[PDB]
Design a protein around this ligand. Structure first.
Ligand code: CA
Ligand code: CA
Ligand code: CA
Ligand code: CA
Lengths: 144, 25
């Protein structure tokens, strides 16, 4: 609903819409889900899209995505959402996101970050200077 | 790299997880 939120969500939409055709398909959603360790079936992917597909055209457009994000903001448990997100990044489950783990996640998400880009993400999140990102640092990065 | 890159890129990745989490149930 705010213009700042719309801009953030537009950037989020772009990650799913890899071909920039303005729609998210089952292929695109599946690609992202699998990159996050999930193993959905095509039937599941179609059902996921169907839920947010207001016009029944089989894909998600930005307006539909916005409606979905507004719904998420109001119904979802924000604290649990951040904990589950941290666990996605922390592949080995040791409590810290390493630069390698971050790069692996981003690469899976189709973002082929440069060495400099990865270093910047870690440096900015790494408040305590140990070279990795702990949970508190992650929370601070996402909420402030 | 501009100073604002990190916050925005972290949030984009976070949102990808949040969207999948929300849409799957
Ligand atoms: Ca697309
Ligand atoms: Ca649609
Ligand atoms: Ca780890
Ligand atoms: Ca740290």
């Amino acid at each position: 609903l705010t213009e700042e939120q719309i801009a953030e969500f537009k950037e989020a939409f772009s990650l799913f819409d890899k071909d920039g055709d303005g729609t998210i398909t089952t292929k695109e959603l599946g690609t992202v889900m699998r990159s996050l360790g999930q193993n959905p079936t095509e039937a599941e992917l179609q059902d996921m899209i169907n839920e947010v597909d207001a016009d029944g055209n089989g894909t998600i457009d930005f307006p539909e995505f916005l409606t979905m994000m507004a719904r998420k903001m109001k119904d979802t448990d924000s604290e649990e959402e951040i904990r589950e997100a941290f666990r996605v990044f922390d592949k080995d489950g040791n409590g810290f996101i390493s630069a390698a783990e971050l790069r692996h996640v981003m690469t899976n998400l189709g973002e082929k970050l440069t060495d400099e880009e990865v270093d910047e993400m870690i440096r900015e999140a790494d408040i305590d200077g140990d070279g990795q990102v702990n949970y508190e640092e992650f929370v601070t990065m996402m909420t402030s | 790299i501009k100073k604002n890159f990190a916050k925005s890129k972290w949030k984009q990745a976070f949102n990808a997880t949040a969207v999948v989490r929300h849409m799957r149930k």
